[PDB]
Amino acid sequence: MDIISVALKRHSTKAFDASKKLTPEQAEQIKTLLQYSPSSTNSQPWHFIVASTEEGKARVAKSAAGNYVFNERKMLDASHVVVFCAKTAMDDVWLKLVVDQEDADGRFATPEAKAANDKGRKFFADMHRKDLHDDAEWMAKQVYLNVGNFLLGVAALGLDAVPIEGFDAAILDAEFGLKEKGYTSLVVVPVGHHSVEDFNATLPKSRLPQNITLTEV
Amino acid sequence: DIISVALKRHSTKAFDASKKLTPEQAEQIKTLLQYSPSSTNSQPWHFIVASTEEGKARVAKSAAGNYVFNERKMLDASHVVVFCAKTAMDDVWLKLVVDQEDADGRFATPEAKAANDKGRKFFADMHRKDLHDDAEWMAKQVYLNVGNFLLGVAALGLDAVPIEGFDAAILDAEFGLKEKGYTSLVVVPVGHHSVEDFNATLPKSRLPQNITLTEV
Ligand SMILES: Cc1cc2nc3c(=O)[nH]c(=O)nc-3n(C[C@H](O)[C@H](O)[C@H](O)COP(=O)(O)O)c2cc1C
Ligand SMILES: Cc1cc2nc3c(=O)[nH]c(=O)nc-3n(C[C@H](O)[C@H](O)[C@H](O)COP(=O)(O)O)c2cc1C
Ligand SMILES: NC(=O)c1cc(N2CC2)c([N+](=O)[O-])cc1[N+](=O)[O-]
Ligand SMILES: NC(=O)c1cc(N2CC2)c([N+](=O)[O-])cc1[N+](=O)[O-]
């Protein structure tokens, strides 16, 4: 069925059925979804942690403490749990890595075309790095775009999920040693299948009317 | 299959100005923008959809400086959507959201409505008072909407291209969204690519998972 039907019917799951795992093929597909999301200048300023074992999810679940105990069950009961992370700083060695990958994938007919791409990426990278001083926020924006792509995609695969901002990033970061690796956790997304306990599965979806949020010209 | 569309979609560099969206597709595009999820269902956004040649030209003005090469995408495309984020989360917006959820029957009792409003106010207060990042927090929700939109339109058989290469100050002044309490973030022309689009035949490139993904 069309994505409009998927968009109108998907929902944030409030409780997962821990016995319903992703199929082996589905496990590979969600990884493909994560990698192929678009990003400004194809910068891909991200890293993903995909927890599928009881041990792995327990380590992620440490972040659902304090005022976030509300999300612990979700992190432990879902089949797979994805931690979306953003680079803490945009370094030149990474920018080079991106251009070389496009080059190796055959996107530049001449060594001038490749040089033109590195320059174009350098323009935006420096605009945020040197002038605006918001490269951390710029990269986080790309990660959130990835989350959006990911949420609709998994729903399209007939999978349930829930985006989570309610977790302790410092706790999660320390658990997986992300700071020293050059990353920071932003959004946690448990994916699997909802249980009968998921009260949100049967409730009507609510959104502000278009006359308030949309202008046609 | 959604994996097929994720692997086949691409950023179109040039649109065929002859291919316009059908009235059904034009409606579906707005449905996608409206139904995207957001933290606490805060929906801190505004969208400007330009379908007329005059409307599109107004948007295209934000690319007259160092972004001249982006004007053609904005004019040749059937529909052009500029994603805007609120500049500040106000109690008036917070009430509109919870009252709308109430109208839509998401609350069984007035206590749940009160609890939902309190839970959202909690997250909203934290960002403006403590973290001092409410503007970026709302902007991130808008980017999440963009991610959802790009996949959605690709699945509809439509071509699109997210554009960051535009002057937000110019675009803001054009549509007066400044006084309205919004800021332009992303421009997304939607339509059908022309035979001229070089990116259409180009292989997609992404870093391998051994670099970006850790399994535990
Ligand atoms: C960035 C982000 C963070 C979220 N964090 C949480 C969370 O911590 N807990 C939760 O139960 N839902 C969370 N949600 C889900 C939203 O509340 C939900 O998307 C919204 O109410 C609309 O409902 P729907 O997703 O079912 O359409 C989050 C959503 C987004 C976009
Ligand atoms: C936030 C954002 C801004 C972008 N801005 C531009 C732009 O100004 N010009 C352009 O040609 N492409 C732009 N793109 C498209 C990206 O360069 C493109 O998604 C990326 O190189 C990956 O290629 P793909 O979209 O074909 O998968 C933008 C993409 C994103 C996510
Ligand atoms: N990687 C790109 O697609 C790209 C290339 C250029 N250069 C070729 C024209 C520019 N830009 O210069 O603004 C901007 C982007 N961008 O996505 O932000
Ligand atoms: N009570 C809820 O079900 C709830 C709680 C949270 N926060 C506390 C974790 C968020 N949210 O943050 O978006 C959203 C919802 N929601 O209504 O979908």
Curated annotation (Swiss-Prot), chain A:
EC number assigned by the record: 1.-.-.-, 1.5.1.34
Keyword Magnesium tagged: no
Protein's UniProt keywords contain NAD: yes
GO terms assigned for molecular function: 6,7-dihydropteridine reductase activity; FMN binding; identical protein binding; NAD(P)H dehydrogenase (quinone) activity; oxidoreductase activity; protein homodimerization activity
Signal sequence coordinates: none
Biological processes, Gene Ontology terms: 2,4,6-trinitrotoluene catabolic process
Residues the entry annotates as binding FMN: R10, H11, S12, T13, K14, N71, E165, G166, K205, S206, R207
Documented activity regulation: Subject to competitive inhibition by dicoumarol, nicotinic acid and acetate with respect to NADH. Subject to uncompetitive inhibition by dicoumarol, nicotinic acid and acetate with respect to nitrofurazone and nitrofurantoin.
InterPro entries registered for this protein in UniProt: NfsB-like, Nitroreductase, Nitroreductase-like, Nitroreductase/BluB
Keywords: Flavoprotein, FMN, NAD, NADP, Oxidoreductase
One GO CC annotation: cytosol
Residues binding NAD(+): K14, T41, N71, K74, R107
Cofactor: FMN
Catalytic activity: 5,6,7,8-tetrahydropteridine + NAD(+) = 6,7-dihydropteridine + NADH + H(+); 5,6,7,8-tetrahydropteridine + NADP(+) = 6,7-dihydropteridine + NADPH + H(+)
Family: Belongs to the nitroreductase family.
Subunit structure: Homodimer.
Purpose: Reduction of a variety of nitroaromatic compounds using NADH (and to lesser extent NADPH) as source of reducing equivalents; two electrons are transferred. Capable of reducing nitrofurazone, quinones and the anti-tumor agent CB1954 (5-(aziridin-1-yl)-2,4-dinitrobenzamide). The reduction of CB1954 results in the generation of cytotoxic species.
PANTHER family membership: NADPH NITROREDUCTASE, OXYGEN-INSENSITIVE NAD(P)H NITROREDUCTASE
Protein name: Oxygen-insensitive NAD(P)H nitroreductase
Species lineage: Bacteria, Pseudomonadati, Pseudomonadota, Gammaproteobacteria, Enterobacterales
From Swiss-Prot, chain B:
GO BP terms: 2,4,6-trinitrotoluene catabolic process
Keyword Oxidoreductase included in the entry's annotation: yes
Binding site for FMN: R9, H10, S11, T12, K13, N70, E164, G165, K204, S205, R206
Cofactor(s) this protein cannot do without: FMN
Top-level EC class: oxidoreductase
Domain of life: Bacteria
Cited Pfam families: Nitroreductase (PF00881)
SUPFAM superfamilies for this protein: FMN-dependent nitroreductase-like (SSF55469)
Activity regulation behaviour: Subject to competitive inhibition by dicoumarol, nicotinic acid and acetate with respect to NADH. Subject to uncompetitive inhibition by dicoumarol, nicotinic acid and acetate with respect to nitrofurazone and nitrofurantoin.
Keywords carried by this UniProt record: Flavoprotein, FMN, NAD, NADP, Oxidoreductase
Molecular function terms from GO: 6,7-dihydropteridine reductase activity; FMN binding; identical protein binding; NAD(P)H dehydrogenase (quinone) activity; oxidoreductase activity; protein homodimerization activity
Residues annotated for NAD(+) binding in this entry: K13, T40, N70, K73, R106
EC number(s) given by UniProt: 1.-.-.-, 1.5.1.34
Catalytic activity: 5,6,7,8-tetrahydropteridine + NAD(+) = 6,7-dihydropteridine + NADH + H(+); 5,6,7,8-tetrahydropteridine + NADP(+) = 6,7-dihydropteridine + NADPH + H(+)
CC per GO annotation: cytosol; membrane
NCBIfam families: PRK11053.1 (NF008275)
PANTHER family reported in the protein's UniProt record: NADPH NITROREDUCTASE, OXYGEN-INSENSITIVE NAD(P)H NITROREDUCTASE
Quaternary organization: Homodimer.
Similarity comment text for this entry: Belongs to the nitroreductase family.
Function: Reduction of a variety of nitroaromatic compounds using NADH (and to lesser extent NADPH) as source of reducing equivalents; two electrons are transferred. Capable of reducing nitrofurazone, quinones and the anti-tumor agent CB1954 (5-(aziridin-1-yl)-2,4-dinitrobenzamide). The reduction of CB1954 results in the generation of cytotoxic species.
Protein name: Oxygen-insensitive NAD(P)H nitroreductase
Organism: Escherichia coli (strain K12)
